[PDB]
Paper text:
To provide insight into the structural basis of the broad neutralizing activity of PN-SIA28 against group 1 and 2 IAVs, PN-SIA28 Fab fragments or Fab variable fragments were prepared and co-crystallized with H1-HA (A/swine/Guangdong/104/2013), H14-HA (A/long-tailed duck/Wisconsin/10OS3912/2010), or H18-HA (A/flat-faced bat/Peru/033/2010). We determined the structures of the PN-SIA28 Fab fragment alone at 2.5 Å and of its Fab variable fragment complexes with H1, H14, or H18 HA at 3.2, 3.4, and 2.6 Å resolution, respectively. The heavy chain paratopes of PN-SIA28 in the PN-SIA28/H1, PN-SIA28/H14, and PN-SIA28/H18 complexes are composed of large portions of CDRH2 and CDRH3, whereas the light chain paratope of PN-SIA28 in the PN-SIA28/H1 complex is composed of large portions of CDRL1. For the interaction between the heavy chain of PN-SIA28 and H1, CDRH3 makes extensive contacts with the bottom of a hydrophobic groove that is formed by residues H18, N20, H38, V40, K280, and T315 (all residues are in H3 numbering) from the fusion domain component of HA1, G16, I18, D19, G20, and W21 of the fusion peptide, and Q38, Q42, I45, D48, and R49 of helix A. Among these resides, F99 (CDRH3) (Kabat numbering) binds in a upper position, and I100A (CDRH3) binds in a lower position, in the nonpolar groove. In particular, Y52A (CDRH2) makes a hydrogen bond with G16 of the fusion peptide, and Y56 (CDRH2) makes a hydrogen bond with K153. S31 (CDRL1) interacts with residue D46 of helix A, and W32 (CDRL1) makes hydrophobic contacts with residues Q42, I45, and R49 of helix A. Other than hydrophobic interactions, W32 (CDRL1) forms hydrogen bonds with D46 of helix A. Additionally, only V40 of H1 HA1, but not H40 of H18 HA1 and K40 of H14 HA1, can form hydrophobic interactions with the CDRH3 of PN-SIA28. All of the above-mentioned interactions involving the amino acids of HA1 contribute to H1 being the HA with the highest affinity for PN-SIA28.
Author numbering:
A (entry chain B): 331 to 487
B (entry chain D): 43 to 149
C (entry chain C): 31 to 154
D (entry chain A): 1 to 182, 185 to 323
């Protein structure tokens, strides 16, 4: 979609947020992070990793067991248990992390897309669209016209 | 603004007690809460960021909790150096708001 | 290693101006936004100022809007708190403070990692 | 007059894997796998561990005179055995249910080593000084265990004995004894052509008709003592009686309940720190919910997984240009 798509590059000079804007009013230029979506995204990712950690309910447990020379069956059984849960938690960890990694990357992608479409929702007739995901103003735009759009308050279309 | 309300305003206890503090605001500040330690005449030291994440090097006995509305700072096994005054921080949006202070005296 | 140094706290009369400063050490200063937070002597910490990494977006407290002015220097890696129209309500132990960096981005709006020693501003 | 909408990128190199593609360069990632330990046989929580040194649980519980330091210990968070822990029983013998014993000794730091049949307050006409051997050499000279008491026949006539112990300490009391299987030395040492030991309780229930044999020597010993144990509850009473071969107890161990722990086998040196989790190789932090350090752990520990890395993505596609 957006990430690795038509917005074919990130912004290294943008180091105050994940998602945001470039303005080019003929009054100045630069980068500016959209703080609302970035705060929301960080909340999401944090609740995500934190939930992956916390739902791991742990207690006090030692794994060691001594079985003598005449208890090989129960020794191999205790292995069967330990190795069993080894395999199970290995598997759930691996797949959980694969799944939610993809799901996170699409989370960012869809957030960026919703920001683009969010500004499209406001600049309908006062902007050409440029396939690198960037808007041209069909009117003259000052150093506050660039702000009204950032805070979701753009005037007559 | 957003107004923080720490409770209780002060508390005395011995070493080894289960200490409970609250930080408590108006808006939805999700988990943007930062707990700070303070010794008299000294600058703060970030204890808890993200309202649960333990700061690097801070002992595991410091713990944070709460979400959105109700916030809490819990200390499991208090130690002599932990005698201090504690401040929570709002970080959802400007301006940054702090609390009234929650000091721990000697019992 | 990493720390922030403060200076400029002195005895001053109401109505006049001062300048406090916080020099950074041990971290990429110009990559972070920064904050000035004042501990009103007797009361708790009170956020007063904050600035972005570039210095184009600046955020102030309502009590000091149009009265104080923050700035920063990349060549000197220093934080400037230029106070105008002082009054005893501004009497406070000033702290320079560093908002924390998170997963990949150096956000301005977060908890504060590193503090200065605390330089005291007295207004008689 | 243009305004662009874009996303973040930085000079990052961390790569996370997804279900549809590999080695995806991502602007930030959080690893969920603790893989660093640094040997430090830490004193988890508060209670310093117990190092048995050159001794094992046998030589520590029996009171082998080689194992004298360990007499001090009243507490420990967990027990440590080493690759040199061989000073177990000098006079050799089957510590029956030794694994069960070791498992039971896996709960808290409750010790009270206290005396029940003092060396000379409870045994008339019974030799309480011939406990000695070239097996339990306290640096050469002959000696015997520090928690058991041998009994002889005054060299020609073995009288009868029965001392019962009631529990009054209000916790579970580990009780230790032995049965001596010596006729060349049965008829000489305890004089009887017929002996028996008898341990009775509400929970332990047995006798032993002692054995005669030329068991291959160990530490220049041909006859041997079988070392037995049991647990006594509050108020309940243990009862001993024998016409021969009672290797009588001397003082036993009053345990309790609370925070249970474990036992270990490792060769590191204890230091000063804490932890919620401890391995035979060293401590680690119970904040990341996974390990690949070692399967045997003690405490509030992460899960052991066979994985090598658990890169979890937080940022987005790192696409500089
Ligand atoms: C690139 O990243 C390294 C850390 O890996 C940092 O030291 C360096 O300053 C960064 N340079 C730029 C231009 O980002």
């Amino acid at each position: 979609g957006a990430i690795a798509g038509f917005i074919e590059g990130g912004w290294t000079g943008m180091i105050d947020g994940w998602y945001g804007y470039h303005h080019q009013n003929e009054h100045g230029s630069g980068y500016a992070a959209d703080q609302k979506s970035t705060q929301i995204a960080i909340d999401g990712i944090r609740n995500k990793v934190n939930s992956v950690i916390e739902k791991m309910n742990i207690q006090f447990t030692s794994v060691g067991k001594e079985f003598n020379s005449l208890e090989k069956r129960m020794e191999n059984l205790n292995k069967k248990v330990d190795d069993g849960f080894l395999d199970v938690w290995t598997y759930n960890a691996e797949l959980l992390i694969l799944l939610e990694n993809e799901r996170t990357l699409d989370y960012h992608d869809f957030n960026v897309k919703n920001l683009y479409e969010k500004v499209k929702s406001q600049l309908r007739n006062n902007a050409k669209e440029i396939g690198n995901g960037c808007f041209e103003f069909y009117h003259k735009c000052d150093n506050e016209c660039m702000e009204s759009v950032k805070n979701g308050t753009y005037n007559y279309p | 603004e957003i107004v923080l309300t720490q409770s209780p305003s002060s508390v005395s206890a011995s070493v080894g007690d289960r200490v409970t503090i609250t930080c408590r605001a108006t808006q939805g500040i999700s988990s943007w809460l930062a707990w700070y330690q303070q010794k008299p005449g000294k600058p703060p030291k970030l204890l808890i960021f993200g309202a649960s994440s333990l700061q690097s090097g801070v002992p595991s006995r410091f713990s944070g909790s709460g979400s959105g509305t109700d916030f809490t700072l819990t200390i499991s096994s208090l130690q002599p150096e932990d005698f201090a005054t504690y401040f929570c921080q709002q970080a959802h949006s400007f301006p940054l708001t702090f609390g009234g202070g929650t000091k721990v005296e000697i019992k | 290693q990493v720390q922030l140094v403060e200076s400029g706290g002195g005895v001053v009369q109401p109505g006049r101006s001062l300048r406090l400063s916080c020099a950074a050490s041990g971290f990429p200063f110009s990559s972070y936004g920064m904050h000035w937070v004042r501990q009103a002597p007797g009361k708790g910490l009170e956020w007063v100022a904050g600035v972005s990494y570039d210095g184009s977006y600046k955020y102030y407290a309502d009590s000091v809007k149009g009265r104080f002015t923050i700035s920063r220097d990349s060549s000197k890696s220093t934080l400037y708190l230029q106070m105008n129209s002082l009054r005893p309500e501004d009497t406070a132990v000033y702290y320079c403070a560093r908002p924390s960096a998170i997963f990949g981005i150096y956000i301005i709006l977060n908890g504060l990692d590193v503090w200065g020693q605390g330089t005291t501003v007295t207004v008689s | 007059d243009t305004i662009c909408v874009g996303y973040h990128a930085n000079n990052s190199t961390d790569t996370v894997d997804t279900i549809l593609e590999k080695n995806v360069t991502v602007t930030h990632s959080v690893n969920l796998l603790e893989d660093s330990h640094n040997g430090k046989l830490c004193s988890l929580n508060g209670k310093s561990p117990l190092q048995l040194g050159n001794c094992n649980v046998a030589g520590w519980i029996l009171g082998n005179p080689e194992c004298d330091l360990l007499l001090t210990a009243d507490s420990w968070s967990y027990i440590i055995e080493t690759s040199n822990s061989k000073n177990g029983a000098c006079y050799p013998g089957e510590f029956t249910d030794y694994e069960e014993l070791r498992e039971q000794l896996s709960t808290v730091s409750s010790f009270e080593r206290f005396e029940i049949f003092p060396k000379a307050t409870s045994w008339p006409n019974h030799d309480t000084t011939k406990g000695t051997t070239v097996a339990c050499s306290h640096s050469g000279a002959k000696s015997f265990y520090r928690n058991l008491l041998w009994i002889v026949q005054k060299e020609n006539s073995y009288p009868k004995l029965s001392n019962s112990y009631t529990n009054n300490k209000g916790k579970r009391v580990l009780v230790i004894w032995g049965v001596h299987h010596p006729y060349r030395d049965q008829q000489a040492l305890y004089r009887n052509n017929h002996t028996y030991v008898s341990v009775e309780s509400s929970k332990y229930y047995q006798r032993f008709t002692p054995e005669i044999v030329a068991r291959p020597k160990v530490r220049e010993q041909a006859g041997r003592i079988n070392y037995y144990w049991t647990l006594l509850d509050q108020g309940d009473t243990i009862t001993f009686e024998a016409t021969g071969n009672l290797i009588a107890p001397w003082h036993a161990f009053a345990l309790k309940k609370g925070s249970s722990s474990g036992m270990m086998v490792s060769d590191a040196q204890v230091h000063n720190c804490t932890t919620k989790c401890q391995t035979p190789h060293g401590a680690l932090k119970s904040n990341l919910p996974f390990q690949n350090v070692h399967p045997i752990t003690i405490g509030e520990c992460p899960k052991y997984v066979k994985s090598t890395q658990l890169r979890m993505a937080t940022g987005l596609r790192n696409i500089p240009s």
